[PDB]
RNA sequence: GGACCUGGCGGUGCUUCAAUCCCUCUAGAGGAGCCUGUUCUGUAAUCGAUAAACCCCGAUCAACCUCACCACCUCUUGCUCAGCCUAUAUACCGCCAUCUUCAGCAAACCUGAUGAAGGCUACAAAGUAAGCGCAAGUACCCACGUAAAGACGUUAGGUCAAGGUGUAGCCCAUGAGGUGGCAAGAAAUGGGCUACAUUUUCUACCCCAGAAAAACGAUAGCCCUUAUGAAACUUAAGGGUCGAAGGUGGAUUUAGCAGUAAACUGAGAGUAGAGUGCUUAGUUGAACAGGGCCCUGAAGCGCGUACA
């Protein structure tokens, strides 16, 4: 009966059955829009109605009512079937994820640029990388740690909480963009000096490195360094490796690091650099803004720096870790 | 924005001129009320809600002020207390504080406007504690020997909290009388009470005792005249229709009391009104509700 | 819980129109009738035929203008005429619009034995009255 | 877009660093005035610490 | 293994509470009969509903039809570009119930040295919150009350037999058509009507009277007739007949805060006809409203259990 038929929207609602007692607590079907490829005025009889499914005129002459030949209608049906199957195949086929740290992990996955700000603020220049995803009693939600960075020193990190993973990501990145640090970089490729820090119970030891050395760091640190714009550095993480603690300590140390210009101004002396690749040539990297000291400055015969036993062991060669220096993909 | 509002003002003026032309009314003297009448006629709508019906008003009345952005083109807020978030409320508080300081240096009729009234006045959203603070400050302003210059301001927040004497008509013979009416339940009664009479009370052309065979109804009829001690001083003609016997008695009693008001002094009228003779009864039968036997009788609770 | 002619709340991403946003009880208070005829009036007849005509016309138009009607269809029965007023998207070509209008006019008129007019008002998109 | 890390550096330091980064499209209104007339102490955040040992408050009494 | 955070649980007491938990006011159910629904038995022979939230419920209603049941018989592209009242409500849409006689649900934003987590102080100390709901607004006769509304979730709640539909299966039959038929009662139970009377019975009348008074008391049973209809033991109505049980009722227990209860009388839905059912209009029209918390449930004061 004609009067019993229902609209496609209601039919699809009933078929999909998204809302239901089972769906309430998780105790698949695809909404194929059957009206996508349909053209108004097309019927199985292949009637060319002028002005609806065919041009109104022809060579300046009004077209009349016509019917496609049997073979022509068959060809039209075959072409429609071909288009339908091509669309279905293209829908079925999937593009592989841009795998993160692991196949089944969210770590390292890029979330794209942060959402634009209201007052004409854009952030297309900022890349966003996930670092951690966790589940969290409800009468369960998702927590996320993400980082954002412009690749030119301005980077930040944030946490997000949401019942939905996508909402958590959106919150985390939109909040990170408002918590940017500015990590000063030496020659725009590496930190200014070795940094040894302890946050909570996570020790981070970062070493400056020459160009091309690459990033040899904990994968999270690699992600953060890529976001910041650091191309070469070494980093050893010890103690508890809680991801949030690691991120917070890394950012703390990087922000607190000291520039050559700042050191030169503080100590009232030229900062001179010596390179093996340049032999004895002294390179004045930074000079004080104020008057330069005539005082030759103390010649500390023996330093009191708190050396790292692991660093000394590596230097003396007693370190024989089979894992150290294992060849690894470009970082 | 302000330019948008000005454009709407111009458009509304042009529409007003269109309407005046359409109705043939002088646009110069064409008023808001005339616009109202014409639009009502031209767009007949049967919605119960006065808001859901069409409207063509001035943009001022039409649009919500939406707090007017509060910052001009430059971006500087207009109100110095703007950053509070309740600029008008706090402006009023500051003004009342100043008036209290000035008064301190120098030295059953109404109530306060309700919190919603104050919120509408200030076009601002307040809280209960905000209303309490404002009202207490106002009360202190009262108690501080508020003079006329201050009482005038206060009365801007105050809210104020008699039976009609019908004309004494005359018959062809010149005999004075007063006519009144009253309805009870489904009964209606029109009573004519004569200034002078021997207590005769004819109902539907019938003597009262005959028409009302129940001494209770007779007592109802007697109640007003007994209350004012005017029994036997008035002749009454009461035409009643509809409803049951008690409803008819009540309607006739109400009509007789109202008619007698015109003949009894104002103090007597006030006394009757206090007693309840002159107050129309709001008690009416409550309609049966579906799924329950009576207006409140829930069907026997099954188990 | 009343499931009848209501749009359940969602995360706020579900746009809805005036009709879909108003529930039945508000009928005759905030929203009027989508069909205006004299059948159901007191002492009149042919309420059933008016209802059948309304249902048939609504289904006919919905199937004729797939993904084109941006609002429900308002039917008016003045005298014996019929007026179908529609809000349609500006997505289908004007030539197709006019042809469909004329065809439906003529066919419905011949079918029900009464003049019929279709009046389309076009919009860039379905008028969102709120989001749910 | 200004960094909301009030515990890291000063307002001037953070704004200057972000501008240098280019993340800040243009210097805020007060930056030039601050640069021209910096306060005697940079408003860096610092957590107060309670003296424990023999260290004493250097505030001398008046006599 | 250590230190922490949250949810759950008591057979957890004190204090507040609730037509409103118990008492308190009125009227009733259970005791008798009848109408009616359900369960068990029976039947060749009806599906669903099933503690509150089934039980004159789907049904605004079954003599055939209705009808989906049984028995028998018959048809094969079948009214339908077939069909299926056959399973699956533990797939759903559609429509609802329950708390709800609630007020909270909430997206989106903004401290714990950025851990699980938290977000209160008005002489205010980090919360703002769109939107939904209550509210507000609207109908009725007010500004009252009743209606209406009543969000998110709760019971895999119901409904595949309103209809649509995922899924399952039948296609010489799980589909379609015609004729005939139970619709009963050991026994229990739910609801309703009528009574047991003297504030009654009965007439007149619609409230100023005269009789009845062990008679009161069946709408049941029997016979006859009438209305409907093709068909009346089937339904309803009218007359006669008979005058039965019973003498205010056990476990116990329902409803009501005022034009309410209670009583009475009309009208409407649906059918050819069919209810003591339902809906609805009106008339007369009151009593208590104050105590407490063992019992129920809701809180705060909180206590102690303990697993996720
Ligand atoms: Mg894998």
UniProtKB/Swiss-Prot annotation, chain A:
Keyword rRNA processing belongs to the record = no
Q: Is the Ribosomal protein keyword given for this protein?
A: yes
* One Gene Ontology term, aspect cellular component: mitochondrion
Annotated compartments? Mitochondrion
The processes (GO biological process) annotated in the record are:
mitochondrial translation; translation
Keywords (A to Z) from UniProt: Mitochondrion, Ribonucleoprotein, Ribosomal protein
The principal location of this protein is mitochondrion
MF-aspect GO terms: RNA binding; structural constituent of ribosome
* Domain S5 DRBM: start-end pairs: 126-183
Tree of life domain: Eukaryota
**Quaternary organization:** Component of the mitochondrial small ribosomal subunit (mt-SSU). Mature mammalian 55S mitochondrial ribosomes consist of a small (28S) and a large (39S) subunit. The 28S small subunit contains a 12S ribosomal RNA (12S mt-rRNA) and 30 different proteins. The 39S large subunit contains a 16S rRNA (16S mt-rRNA), a copy of mitochondrial valine transfer RNA (mt-tRNA(Val)), which plays an integral structural role, and 52 different proteins.
In the record, the note on similarity to other proteins reads: Belongs to the universal ribosomal protein uS5 family.
- The identity of this protein, by name, is Small ribosomal subunit protein uS5m
Q: Which part of the entire sequence is included in the shown chain? A: 88 to 430 of 430
From Swiss-Prot, chain B:
Biological process according to GO:
mitochondrial translation
- The coiled-coil segments of this chain are none
What does the UniProt entry say about where the protein is found? Mitochondrion
Q: Which residues carry this modification: N6-acetyllysine?
A: 195
Q: Where is this region: Disordered?
A: 282-303
Any Gene Ontology CC annotation: mitochondrial small ribosomal subunit
Q: Which domain of life is it from?
A: Eukaryota
- UniProt entry keywords in alphabetical sequence: Acetylation, Mitochondrion, Ribonucleoprotein, Ribosomal protein, Transit peptide
- Signal peptide boundaries: none
Give the main localization category: mitochondrion
Q: How does it associate, per the subunit comment?
A: Component of the mitochondrial small ribosomal subunit (mt-SSU). Mature mammalian 55S mitochondrial ribosomes consist of a small (28S) and a large (39S) subunit. The 28S small subunit contains a 12S ribosomal RNA (12S mt-rRNA) and 30 different proteins. The 39S large subunit contains a 16S rRNA (16S mt-rRNA), a copy of mitochondrial valine transfer RNA (mt-tRNA(Val)), which plays an integral structural role, and 52 different proteins.
Family from the record: Belongs to the universal ribosomal protein uS9 family.
Put simply, this protein is called Small ribosomal subunit protein uS9m
Q: What organism does the record attribute this protein to?
A: Homo sapiens (Human)
Task: Identify the segment of the full-length protein shown.
Answer: 70 to 395 of 396
Swiss-Prot record, chain C:
Quote one Gene Ontology molecular function term: RNA binding
Major location, coarse class? mitochondrion
List UniProt keywords, sorted A-Z. Answer: Mitochondrion, Ribonucleoprotein, Ribosomal protein, Transit peptide
Top-level taxon of origin? Eukaryota
Q: Does the keyword Transit peptide apply?
A: yes
Q: Where in the cell is it found?
A: Mitochondrion
Q: What GO cellular-component annotations does this UniProt entry give?
A: mitochondrial inner membrane; mitochondrial small ribosomal subunit; mitochondrion
Name its GO BP terms in alphabetical order: mitochondrial translation
Describe its partners and assembly state: Component of the mitochondrial small ribosomal subunit (mt-SSU). Mature mammalian 55S mitochondrial ribosomes consist of a small (28S) and a large (39S) subunit. The 28S small subunit contains a 12S ribosomal RNA (12S mt-rRNA) and 30 different proteins. The 39S large subunit contains a 16S rRNA (16S mt-rRNA), a copy of mitochondrial valine transfer RNA (mt-tRNA(Val)), which plays an integral structural role, and 52 different proteins.
Record's family?
A: Belongs to the universal ribosomal protein uS3 family.
* Designated name of the protein: Small ribosomal subunit protein uS3m
Q: Which organism is it from?
A: Homo sapiens (Human)
Q: Which gene encodes it?
A: MRPS24
From the entire protein, which fragment is shown?
Answer: 36 to 167 of 167
Curated annotation (Swiss-Prot), chain D:
Provide a GO CC annotation, any one.
mitochondrial inner membrane
First-listed, main subcellular location of the protein, grouped into a coarse class: mitochondrion
Query: Which biological process terms from the Gene Ontology are attached to this UniProt entry?
Result: mitochondrial translation
Q: Which GO terms describe its molecular function?
A: RNA binding; structural constituent of ribosome
Entry keywords, A to Z: Acetylation, Disease variant, Mitochondrion, Primary mitochondrial disease, Ribonucleoprotein, Ribosomal protein
Q: Which disease is it linked to?
A: Combined oxidative phosphorylation deficiency 46: An autosomal recessive disorder characterized by childhood-onset mitochondrial respiratory chain complex deficiencies, particularly complexes I and IV, and hepatic disease.
- Name used for this protein in its record: Small ribosomal subunit protein mS23
Q: Give the organism, scientific name.
A: Homo sapiens (Human)
Write the gene name: MRPS23
Which residues of the parent protein does this chain contain?
A: 2 to 64 of 190
